[PDB]
Amino acid sequence: NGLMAKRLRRELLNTYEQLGKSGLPFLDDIGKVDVKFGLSLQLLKSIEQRGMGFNSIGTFKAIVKLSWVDTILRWDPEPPFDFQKIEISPDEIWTPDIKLFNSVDLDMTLDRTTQAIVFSNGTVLWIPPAVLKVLCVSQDDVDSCHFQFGSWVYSVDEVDIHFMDDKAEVLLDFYQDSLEILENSAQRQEVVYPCCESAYVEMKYLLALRSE
Amino acid sequence: NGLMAKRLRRELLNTYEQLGKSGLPFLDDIGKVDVKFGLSLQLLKSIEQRGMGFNSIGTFKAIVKLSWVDTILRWDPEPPFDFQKIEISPDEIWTPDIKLFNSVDLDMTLDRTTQAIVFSNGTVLWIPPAVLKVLCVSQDDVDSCHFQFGSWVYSVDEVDIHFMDDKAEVLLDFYQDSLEILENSAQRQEVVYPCCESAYVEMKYLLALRSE
C-alpha cells in the first residue's frame, strides 16, 4: 500500500526532523559506523597542464558508492509496514562526511539529488555520481593522479571505512572511456594529522593513465 | 472558475505536502510507473576535442519529453472541478529520477522551473529544456555521441521506460541546427548491474553528426 509506505518514511524521518541530522546515527550506545566505500571511474573530463611544469589538474567523472548502517532508520516489516526498502533523500538523513581531502576545489561534488535506498535492517545504500578534481603529475606521456578520501571530523573510533566488496582499486563497472589505464591501486590507511590527536581512516587511490 | 481551479490543485497536492514526494506515485496498491521518454535534439552548443586524442566533449541543447501516470493526482472532472487539466510545478510532485548516466557532468540539467501539465486521469506531461554533455568520438570528420538514460534507483518492476510514440531515435520535432545527421538510433535495454541484484531499464541513443 502506497500510503503506508509514505507514512513509514515520515515516521522514520520524524527522528531526524525532531533531533536533527547531526551526530553519529545511534540513539543508544554510541558505536562505530563502518562505511563501505567504492570509487567507480566513468571517464576523464580533462587533464590540463598547470603553467609550464610537470603538474596538471585532472578532472574526472565517477560514481561514488557508499553503504553504512543507520540504526535509527530500522523497522520491522510486519504489516501494514511490510516493505523491505524505501527510498530517501540523502539530505533528510545522516550521511558520512567523507570528502576528497586533496581536492583542488573545496571538495568533489556529489549529486545529492540522487536518492538513497534504506533497507528494513537499517543498511543504507547511496550511489551518487561525482566530479573529482585533483592535482596530477604528467611525465613521460603518463598522467598519475591520486585521490584521498576520508571523514572530515570523525576519527577511526567513530567512522571507519573499508573498500566495498574488499576491492582495493578504482572500479570499472561504470567505466565508459577509451583511456589506457597503466596503474590502478589503493590502500586503506589510518592517518594521524599534525593538527589533531587521533587517527582518521584515509582511502588512497592511485590512477595512472596514458596521456592523449 | 479560477479560484476553484486553484482549490483543486491545493486539494490534489495536499498528499504530497503532508507526506513528501518520495516513493512511487500510488496511494493504494503500489504498481509500476511506465515513463514515456522522448529526446528531441534542438542544437549543438559545442564539440570540443579532449587533449590531442580522438575523443571530444559534446554539449547539446535538447527538449526532454516525459509522460507518466500519477494516480495521486486524479480527479473526477464533475463541476465545480470541471477542469480537463491543471498546470503544476515538477518540484511539487513526484517525478521520475531519470538521469543521463554517461554525463561528463554530474547529470544533464533539466529546467525544473518549467511547469508540468496533469490531466484529470492522472497523466502527467512534462517537457523540460535540457542541457546534455557527453563524451563523443571524433574521427574522420564524424562525431559519434552516445546518450544513456535510466531511473537511478528504480528497477523495471517499479519504473519502466519506453520511447515516446515508440520512436527509437533522437526526435527532430524541435531541431534547429544546420548539422548533418549521419546516424540516429536507439535501443531500450533491461540491464543488470554488478553492484545490484535487479534489472533497470536503460535507453541508449547513438547520434552521429558530420563535423564542422
Add this chain to the structure above:
Amino acid sequence: NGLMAKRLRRELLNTYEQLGKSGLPFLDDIGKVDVKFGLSLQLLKSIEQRGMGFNSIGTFKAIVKLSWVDTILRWDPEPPFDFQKIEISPDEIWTPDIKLFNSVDLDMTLDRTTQAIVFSNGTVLWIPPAVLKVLCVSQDDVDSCHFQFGSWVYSVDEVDIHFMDDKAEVLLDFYQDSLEILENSAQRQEVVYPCCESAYVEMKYLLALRSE
C-alpha cells in the same frame, strides 16, 4: 511607503500564499491573459564561432519588458489602502512562463530579484534585465541571430502575447553598444508544434549585426 502599504501587500498576496501562484491569474471566470512583450537590446557580450563552421554562439544583454493584467491583485484605492500602485517580488505572484525557446542554454536568464509594479486595476509591469544566448549564422561580415519567445505551457486561448508599443522589432531605448544594426524585424505567430494539438503564440525576432 508605510505599514498600511505593507498591509495592503499582505492582503493582496494572501490569495497566492493560500492557493499558490500556479494557474492563470483569474478570480472568477477564467479568461485569457494578454501579455505585452518588449525586447530592448542593451549590448553584445560575445559572438563566438562554433568550431570551424559558419555558426556562432551570440550572447546578449537585454532588458525584457512585460505587462499583463492580474485580476487577483486588484483593489479599490480608497482609505486606508489609497495607493495607486505597489511593488511586489515576481516570485510571489503569477508571472507569464515566457521562455526563450531557441536558447542554447536551458533558457534566457531574467533577474527575478527585480521588483514588479502592480497598479490598483491589476495591471502588472515587470522590467527585468536578461541574458540571452542563441545560435547565430556568421557569414559575409554579418552576424544574423534569431530569438523565439513564447509561453511554455499556455496556448493562445490561455496566454496571448503582443509586441509592446506595437513595435515589431528589437527595441533600442536601452541600446548602449557601438555595433551597427543591419536588420531588425519581428513577427507574432500562432504556432502548432508536432508534440501537441493547441496553437501557442510565438514572437520571433530577427537581428543582424555588422561583425567586428
Add this chain to the structure above:
Amino acid sequence: NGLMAKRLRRELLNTYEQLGKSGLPFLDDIGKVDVKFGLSLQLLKSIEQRGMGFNSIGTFKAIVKLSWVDTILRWDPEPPFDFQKIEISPDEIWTPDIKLFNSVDLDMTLDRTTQAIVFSNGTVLWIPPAVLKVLCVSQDDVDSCHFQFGSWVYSVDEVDIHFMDDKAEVLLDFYQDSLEILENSAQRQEVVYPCCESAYVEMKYLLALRSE
C-alpha cells in the same frame, strides 16, 4: 547583555517578519529615502577584448558603500536595550534596489552575506564587496569604462542617491592594484527613460585606465 542584544534585534525585525521587506522603510507613510553611495575600486580582475574590435569586457573587484535611514529599525538606547548599534543581515531588512544598469551580466554581484550595521536612530551602513562587469572601450593604450547605478523601480521622489561624502569619483580608499588611473569622474543625473514616466536618479561613473 548579549541575549538582550538578540531580543532587541528580534523586536526590531518583528515588523519585517510579519509584513515583509518590500516597500520603502517608513514606519509609516510618506517619505523619501536618501541613499549615500560610494564606489571604492579595489582591483582589476581582467579586461578582455571583444572579438577583434575596439570594445572589451572589463571585470572589476570593488567595495560598494551604502547608507540610508530605516525608520522601522529605530529604538531608544535605554536599558535594557542600551545599544548604540546592532548588526543585521541585509536579507532580513529592506535594502535599496540599486543595480549596475549597464552590467554585461544581469547585474553586478554584491556579497549579501556581509552584515549591515544599524544605529539606534535608524541609520543603516552596509558595505558589501562587489564584482562589476561592464563594456569598455580600449583604444590607444587606454581602457575607458563607465558604471551607471540607480534604483531599478524607485523614482527620485521615492529613492534619492548622493555621492557618499560628496566625492563624485571612484574612491581609492581600498585601491590595491598597480594600474594607472587616467580619468576618474562621476555625475549625478536625474533621468527620464523612454519606457517609463518618472525621473530616476543615476550615478554615472567614468574610469579610464592605462592599458597593461
Add this chain to the structure above:
Amino acid sequence: NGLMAKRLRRELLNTYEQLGKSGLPFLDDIGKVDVKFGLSLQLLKSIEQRGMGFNSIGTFKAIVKLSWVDTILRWDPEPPFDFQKIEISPDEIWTPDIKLFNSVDLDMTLDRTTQAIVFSNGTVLWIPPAVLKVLCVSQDDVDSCHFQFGSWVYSVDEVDIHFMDDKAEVLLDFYQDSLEILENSAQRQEVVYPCCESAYVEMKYLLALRSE
C-alpha cells in the same frame, strides 16, 4: 548514549533557534571574541597572468583553521550530558565574519558543510577547506602573493584575531604540492580605515613561490 547527545545539541542550539545566530556569542556581558586563525596551504590550482603585465590571478587551495569561545554553547559535562564535545553545523551557530579582504572574487569560499566541533567549555574548533583567489606579482620567475584576513564588521574590541599556535606564517601541515616556497611570513595588524572610525584586526600573509 546517542539520544542524550542529540538532546544536548538541541538544547544548546535552542537559543540560536529562538533569538537568531546574529550578534556576538555571549550569554551575559558582551565581551571580546578572541579568534585563533591558521592558514594551511594545500596546493596551487593556477597562476594566470593578467593581460600582458606583471600581475597574475593566483588561485589556491587551503585549509582554514578557526577557533573561538561561544559561552552560549557551554554545558556541564555531567551525566546524562557527560560528553566532552559534540559536532555542530557552522550554519546553526554564530561564526566570525572573517573575510579575504583582497579577494579577486567577492570573497574566499569556505566549505560550510563541514562540521565544527564544540567542547563543553564553549570552545568551538572549525576547520573548513577554502579556495582563495588573489592578485599576485609575477616577476623574475617568482610569484608573490598577499592574503589579508579580517572580520568585516567587528572592530578589535569586539572580535580579536591571533595566529593559531602563535605561528605567524602560512602553515605547511597540509602542504601537498611540489612548488618551492621562497617567502612565507605573516603579521597581525590593527587597522583604521578611511570609511569608518574604529580599528580592525587584519592578518596579512606574504607568500612567494618559485614560478614553474
